[model samples]
Target: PSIRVVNLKKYFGKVKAVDGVSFEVKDGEFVALLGPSGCGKTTTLLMLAGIYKPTSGEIYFDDVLVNDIPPKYREVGMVFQNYALYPHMTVFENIAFPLRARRISKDEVEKRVVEIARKLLIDNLLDRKPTQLSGGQQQRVALARALVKQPKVLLFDEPLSNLDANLRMIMRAEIKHLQQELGITSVYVTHDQAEAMTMASRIAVFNQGKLVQYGTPDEVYDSPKNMFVASFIGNPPTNFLRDFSVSVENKQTILKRDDVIIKLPEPVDVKLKEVVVGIRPEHCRISRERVENSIPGVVYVVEPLGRDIIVNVKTEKGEIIKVFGDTGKAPQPGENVFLVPDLRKIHLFNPETEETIL
Candidate 1:
């Protein structure tokens, strides 16, 4: 089933928790609502699930307005961050609770519960109570319980946030695969960028209760709409050289700082007098010898993360930018090095609007 929300707004006291947000989820598509905490991602999901009434908006499920529907009647299954399970109930009972509430036949409930438990790999834990299960097992039980309903739409609200890193990775893959196999339209809300990037078919980034950017993982990552989207989407994030200017001469664009100049192969279309130049850390190359489009800087910090290195360099202009390099091979702190940006991957943004300039 496809889901669409238009002009959604929610207010709590003085705070506009969700402000004029709108987007669409295609049938069987996995969409992730990604943002920092308190950025309205979860609130948007709750609205879609019919748990939170929007102040002003319409929610549609395949062209039928569902804004006034109750959560229980929405044909959607939800898993929360806390894995809200009945501590006293056995795994089997928990998985069967929803069906039992509807006065389903015992045989039907048992069959569905068994199928979901087996599929979620929780059959072995059916006899255990929630308190007796590990975090991952409890999560599986919660997922199984939700899936047992055969919901047309699945909503996950940071469902894997409580698990350890490795367990979270495994559960993310499992949830993604399950959604694919069942072909269920899903909306997942998470503050974790990596989780959203790994699981979502498309990511909708939120900030200050507004929908900032919505696109496939590669589109959002490679070509962000603004500084916020660029910084929020990637780990370590894209590096910014702020308060820069660009000039066109001889049909080429040249980026200039206080004492640095680099001619670009192509011209940017922004008309702003002041701009922010952005480049991903991974797109930067570190060299011992200075080259064209390279700026000399002093290494400020080096961090090794098994396979890659993050080197922070302080330019002569006092702006700090990160460069991704090979592990165990980055310039030492205080060492003079050249930070060369890959011109093809460079991005420019208008400072006032914070929007990208092609």
Candidate 2:
């Protein structure tokens, strides 16, 4: 099933929970609704599921306008954050609940329930209650319950959030693979950037009830449309050097802030005199000596993270810049250092608007 939303808005009295969001999910594709808490990602998912109607706008499942359809008639299956299993019911009963509600024959309900249970590797647990199963096992039963009906569209509302770290990782791959195998159009909602990046075919980033950006994982990460996306998508987060004067010197754009100056490879088109410069920590290179087009700083803190060393550099102007460093070759605290940001990877943004200066 293909899902389409146009100018979707959900308002609670004076508060706008979702304001004019729009996006499309292709047939059999996995699209993630990504954002932090209170960002309206879940509200949008509920609207799509017909749990919450849109205050204004349209929702289409394939060619059918589903704005007025009830939750059960929408032909969409939802797996919630808490698994939502019935404590009094066995796994077999939980998986057959949807079918039983629709008055399917007992034999067919048992057949479909056991079929999906085994597919999710939870067949043996069918006789057990939710309270008797582990978190991961309960989650599998949840998936089995959602898949038994074979809905054209499957909606996941933070399905892996309750699992521990290792289980979360394992379930991520399993869900992605299962969705691919089933070829069901899926919309997943999550606040975790890593989960969205790893599992989603495309990501829709939301903030404060607004849809900020929508694109593939690499597209969003490498070329974020604004400062919010740049900061939200990355793990260590993009560092911002704010309040810099912009001027063109020869063919290069010069960014000047007190004692530090950064020269862009080519002239910038922005007319704004002041802007914020952004560079990811991974793109910030640390050097022992002053290099070409590098800014001078003092090593403030050196942390040895497993694979990558995190080095915090305090510039002359007292701005702390974070950068990834080599494990053994990183400079110690109180030592002099230089930061050379990758010019191609550096981002410029309008200070007042907080939008990328592309």
Candidate 3:
């Protein structure tokens, strides 16, 4: 089902849980509601599930108004973080529960359940209860239950958060593949940026109960709308050189903070004199020797992360910025180095509104 949420607001007492959020989930598209805890992502998912009614706004499933539709009538299947499998029931019975509730015959129920169970790789575990299965198997059983009924829409709320790291990655790819094969419209709720970036066709980033940005993973990662998106979308986050005064030299724009000067690329038309400069760790490099147009800093911390290293450098003015580099060239703490950023990839933001200007 194609889903549309227009000016949706959910209030719990006086708290604005989901305040005026609007985004459309295309048919067969996987859209992830991404945000930190208490950002109303879960509340929005609950509203979509028909478990929580919107305080003010509209919800439509494929052009049909479903604001007053009950959960049983919405034809939506959900997989929660807890798995929510019946403990006493066997895996087969659990997968058949939804079908049986709709008065599906025993033969059809077994057929549908077996078909989905085989697809989810849980056919051999059908005779065992949830307690007898591993976390991954239990997750597959839960997914099988959701798919057996063939609902128009599917919803998941951090379904893999309970699994271990290796299992989580495996299941992430599996579920993404399964969703594509099923071609079901899905709205997944997850705080993990990696999960959202890898699994979702589009991401709706939330903050303080508002839809801050909505776009594809690359769009959100490369062209973040505001400071929050820029800060949240990246791993290790983007570095901020705040309160830098903009200047022009030889027809070239430069950001000057104390003695440190950062040259901006050509065609730079910055209106404001004071702006914040943002650059990702991967866009910057660390050099032991002096480099042209670079900031001198002392390495404050060096973290070796197997394949790569994260270098935290403290500038003369005590601004700590991180740089990602190869392990073979990683510098040790207390080593003096120059921080060189790729000027072509720099991001500019207004200090007042925290909005990206370039």
Q: How many residue pairs clash in each candidate?
A: 0, 0, 0
Model 3 agreement with the true structure over 240-332: per-residue lDDT tens digits: 878889878899998888878788768698888999889899999888899777889999998864356889999887888988976577677
- Which candidate number has the best TM-score? 3
Q: Considering lDDT, which of the candidate structures 2 and 3 is the better prediction for this target?
A: 3
Per-residue lDDT tens digits for candidate 1, residues 161-256, read 888887887889888898898899999999999899999999999999999999999999988999999999777788888888777778788888
| CA-only RMSD, every prediction | 2.1, 2.4, 1.8
Following a full C-alpha superposition, what root-mean-square deviation does model 1 have from the true structure? 2.1
lDDT-better candidate, 1 vs 3: 3
Each model's lDDT comes to 0.87, 0.88, 0.89
User: What global local distance difference test value does model 1 have?
Assistant: 0.87
Comparing 2 with 3 on TM-score, the higher-scoring candidate is 3
Indicate the residue-level lDDT of 115 in model 3.
90
User: In terms of TM-score, how similar is model 2 to the real structure?
Assistant: 0.91
Give the candidate number with the greatest lDDT: 3
TM-score of each: 0.93, 0.91, 0.95
Between candidates 1 and 2, name the one with more favorable TM-score.
1
